[PDB]
């Protein structure tokens with residue numbers, strides 16, 4: 018009776034979410050036609066969490082596809098598992114945001130928010146009790162960053178007691194994709210610190226070295242990156258969809274991992290990742306999962322977790338396993354290196370067990386880390402933002418759409434306030 | 445729907461578009477008769493059944509080049525009234541293309557813009573083609589861009605202009621026509637891409653290793669960049685970039701909107717088998733100073749912001765792996781306040797090679813359009829070319845008698861000197 | 875019940891799953907790399923059998939490469955420990 022409405026914004030959210038529904042619907046056994054052909058009875062126990070039952074045995078994803086260009090909608094629809102969504106939920110613009118935060122939040126976003134809020138309320142009122150909202154987007158863009166954060170602000174006004182997951186990628190330090198990345202990112206985090214209930218932080222270049230160094234994959238593309246993103250998405254809501262020895266809904270993770278209302282920026286990773294040349298040499302057992310779980314290079318965020326102490330951690334274990342040996346790995350990881358954990362929170366790591374593993378994997382686990390080293394990621398975007406805003410470069414496309422320079426001085430202050438409050442808890 | 449209208453002005457505009465529309469019919473399989481034996485909507489409008497017509501206008505005051513297209517191999521491709529001829533040319537005079545004879549034909553020019561913009565559902569940009577060294581390209585172009593600015597607000601215009609080379613130039617009054625042309629194209633054109641003849645001569649001399657080529661080989665090689673810049677509206681890719689994304693990721697300031705252009709794999713047919721092309725290898729070749737399309741050495745200035753637009757089988761880490769080595773290289777130097785300086789765009793078709801063209805089939809391609817502070821040199825040289833000739837008032841009585849007053853040269857001189865101060869000011873380290 | 879009209883196919887020129895930009899080595903397997911995407915073997919040491927099978931005769935190059943492999947095998951041999959059998 019707990020359900021999640023998925024919202025996908027921009028080219029990043031549509032591409033990630035198309036792979037996300039390829040993973041979840043395969044995990045519940047939904048073929049691309051839309052009906053059910055799995056061989057397990059337990060998949061139909063909790064199917065209303067991500068699906069709406071329709072006529073003829075057809076299951077439609079509870080997904081809302083929103084952007085400002087028609088290009089990504091045709092890419093999602095023409096791809097495999099693209100015929101399962103409602104054509105009514107394909108809300109899209111025509112002009113295009115053009116990678117601009119001002120265009121997506123003020124001038125070409127506003128005439129589409131009333132269109133997408135109409136189908137937000139249609140999906141929510143159709144289902145029983147909203148567990149929360151899950152949104153996947155980017156922060157360097159303008160189609161999903163500016164417009165998506167406008168949708169979060171409207172949903173937070175309409176539904177203030179419901180949870181909110183945001184899965185966002187950030188501008189990378191090593192390389193870059195657009196030139197106006199720090200302008201869009203600093204404005205987006207300014208709109209995410211008050212509105213998002215908990216934000217999982219992703220980085221496309223912490224995904225690449227996972228794909229290259231760990232997976233030993235010679236040619237990783239965006240399709241390979243989104244599948245590693247989508248694997249973690251199924252891990253967060255594993256206890257909702259399937260029974261477990263110690264269940265943990267989305268709110269149980271929130272109360273454990275959020276010590277203070279502004280420190281909800283997390284980092285995530287997926288534990289059983291091996292190359293195909295290292296499948297047979299791997300002895301899959303829970304101690305082997307925890308060494309990869311707590312490894313810094315398995316984190317999907319570019320911030321190194323050894324540089325800051327862990328405020329709170331959590332693991333979403335899946336599969337048949339013994340609870341005390343899960344527990345004694347958690348007691349060990351807080352005792353072998355206790356300098357990496359916060360002194361004034363005893364028993365930092367929260368554990369949960371789901372009795373049903375993912376398809377083709379005997380044991381899996383999903384980590385959520387609220388490490389204070391996340392301030393290194395926000396300070397380098399702020400380092401890029403203070404450089405560009407000082408010469409007022411690329412600002413006339415932002416100030417021509419009705420957003421004067423006062424918001425930029427406000428957005429930089431909250432970004433600098435976000436890194437100062439993480440820094441003092443490292444002390 | 446995404447779609448863009450092209451405008452071809454002047455003798456160079458007709459011949460560039462002659463090679464440009466030769467390519468576009470090939471990449472979508474459109475035969476020269478106009479019948480195809482989804483993606484064509486950005487340049488071809490579906491008329492009736494089995495007929496496509498280009499989204500262009502061919503306007504030129506000299507009737508000798510429009511009727512060549514009318515009697516050429518693309519007689520059936522173009523709408524007959526879509527190509528606009530004229531009675532007499534401007535004949536290397538800015539005043540004739542702006543005051544005397546330009547005002548008569550410009551009414552017919554905007555009228556076809558009505559029918560092309562009303563037929564198109566969502567217009568996304570304008571592609572204006574001209575050479576400022578001539579009368580029709582500069583004079584009628586400034587008049588046309590004046591009326592398009594008042595009638596279409598906030599619509600992007602892409603301007604592919606051909607400035608004179610410091611050494612290799614054809615007409616004597618090209619500095620006079622170029623300086624007056626700047627008074628319009630700064631405050632009207634949103635995105636301008638500068639091209640130069642001798643830089644393309646140098647690209648043809650070494651990279652294609654063809655000894656004695658002509659304008660037909662330039663226009664075929666210019667159209668590769670024109671196709672690659674708008675390849676995202678045509679064909680799908682990992683990182684689609686629209687015409688409004690170059691319009692915002694490349695210009696830091698409203699009056700700095702001139703950019704270079706380059707094309708990485710420029711390899712002849714005989715050299716293709718010996719040469720190995722890699723994403724790291726062509727990206728290093730794309731940033732070579734000899735491969736620029738305008739003769740300004742980029743080492744003298746700093747790159748403002750670059751937009752690498754890729755084609756073919758390029759995986760998204762290899763544009764990222766290539767740009768990692770590019771940023772570490774010391775010869776390439778950015779301005780200090782622009783840490784992220786790259787725009788990446790990856791489409792999936794390899795570039796369609798034309799039959800009879802010297803360019804070979806390449807699996808990968810890069811089109812790098814970059815703003816840089818070295819563009820002040822191509823403006824300062826024409827600045828030096830013009831005051832030296834205007835000092836004792838030569839070739840002025842031709843301009844004075846054709847409606848233009850003497851003071852417009854003084855206003856255009858002051859406006860161009862303001863651009864010289866702007867490129868120097870934006871490149872200052874603080 | 876009402877008029878059935880199919881919407882026109884208007885869209886960007888899509889590409890198949892065979893392209894390098896959209897190939898997914900983890901497709902329907904939940905974050906495990908698929909078969910037929912094996913790891914690159916180190917140095918890609920081709921055996922002499924694949925060269926002899928494409929040449930018509932055992933040429934001098936094949937004979938020299940077989941001599942090199944024979945020297946490698948003679949270096950590997952130990953004269954005290956048989957392969958899978960004990961001392962002597």
Ligand SMILES: Nc1nc2c(ncn2[C@@H]2O[C@H](COP(=O)(O)OP(=O)(O)OP(=O)(O)O)[C@@H](O)[C@H]2O)c(=O)[nH]1
Nearest residue numbers: 454455456533534535536575577578579580581659
């Ligand atoms: N790159 C390139 N440039 C050309 C080509 N054809 C003409 N040009 C340019 O055109 C300039 C000569 O003046 P034009 O622009 O042709 O004169 P116009 O546009 O016909 O103006 P009017 O003669 O008054 O009608 C030269 O400096 C060339 O740079 C061409 O095929 N390729």
Ligand SMILES: Nc1nc2c(ncn2[C@@H]2O[C@H](COP(=O)(O)OP(=O)(O)O)[C@@H](O)[C@H]2O)c(=O)[nH]1
Nearest residue numbers: 027028029032155158159160161194221239242
């Ligand atoms: N994981 C993932 N990230 C992507 C993909 N496509 C783009 N991105 C990221 O999105 C950022 C650029 O955002 P953009 O494409 O402009 O988003 P938009 O403005 O919402 O359309 C880059 O930093 C990329 O790393 C994808 O298919 N998968």
Ligand SMILES: [Mg+2]
Nearest residue numbers: 455506533580
């Ligand atoms: Mg002429």
